[PDB]
């Protein structure tokens, strides 16, 4: 259907790669909230994070996501920590089908907008997952090459 598809999960989950494939196979618009932030600030997303601090970044991100989710027929790759906001999570759930790309710590560490230039120690990623995994799972309607995964998701939505 035309219904929105929102991809959630940690950085390195393939939100952008899988989302672009989904958008092309379903002939929909693709958006990346990190990319929209860069577009509105004219700067690297990680730079905006570092300069504005968490508080300011999260507010800006929440506003960006509120606006994107109001669109129709789009595939959205949401920021990894965008699920921290309760309002955002309720908006994501209500405005489209939420697909959670469950990702191991290993995959997250794995090889190449970038919120952070370099990978952190495993401990940091484990700590993040303990806080965020329950958030991703709370709003997931569907839990999971990009082409293969994209069609699998599609088969699940069917």
Swiss-Prot record:
Binding site for ATP: 12-17
PROSITE patterns per the UniProt record, alphabetical: SHIKIMATE_KINASE
Pfam family of the protein (one): SKI
GO function terms (MF aspect): ATP binding; magnesium ion binding; shikimate kinase activity
Residues binding Mg(2+): 16
Cofactor note: Binds 1 Mg(2+) ion per subunit.
Induction details: Constitutively expressed.
GO CC terms, sorted: cytosol
Chain positions recorded as substrate binding sites: 34, 58, 80, 132
Enzyme Commission code(s) on record: 2.7.1.71
Family stated for the protein in its record: Belongs to the shikimate kinase family.
Stated name of the protein: Shikimate kinase 1
Native organism: Escherichia coli (strain K12)
Gene: aroK
């Amino acid at each position: 259907e035309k219904r929105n598809i929102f991809l959630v999960g940690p950085m390195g989950a393939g939100k952008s790669t899988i989302g672009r494939q989904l958008a092309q196979q379903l002939n929909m618009e693709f958006y990346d909230s990190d990319q929209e932030i860069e577009k509105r600030t004219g700067a690297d997303v990680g730079w905006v994070f570092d300069l504005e601090g968490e508080e300011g970044f999260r507010d800006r991100e929440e506003k960006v996501i509120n606006e994107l989710t109001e669109k129709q027929g789009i595939v959205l790759a949401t920021g990894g920590g965008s699920v921290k906001s309760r309002e955002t999570r309720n908006r994501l759930s209500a405005r489209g089908v939420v697909v959670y790309l469950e990702t191991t710590i290993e995959k997250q560490l794995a090889r190449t907008p970038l919120l952070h230039v370099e990978t952190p120690p495993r401990e940091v990623l484990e700590a993040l997952a303990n806080e965020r995994n329950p958030l991703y799972e709370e709003i997931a309607d569907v839990t999971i090459s990009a082409k293969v995964v994209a069609n699998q998701i599609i088969h699940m939505l069917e």
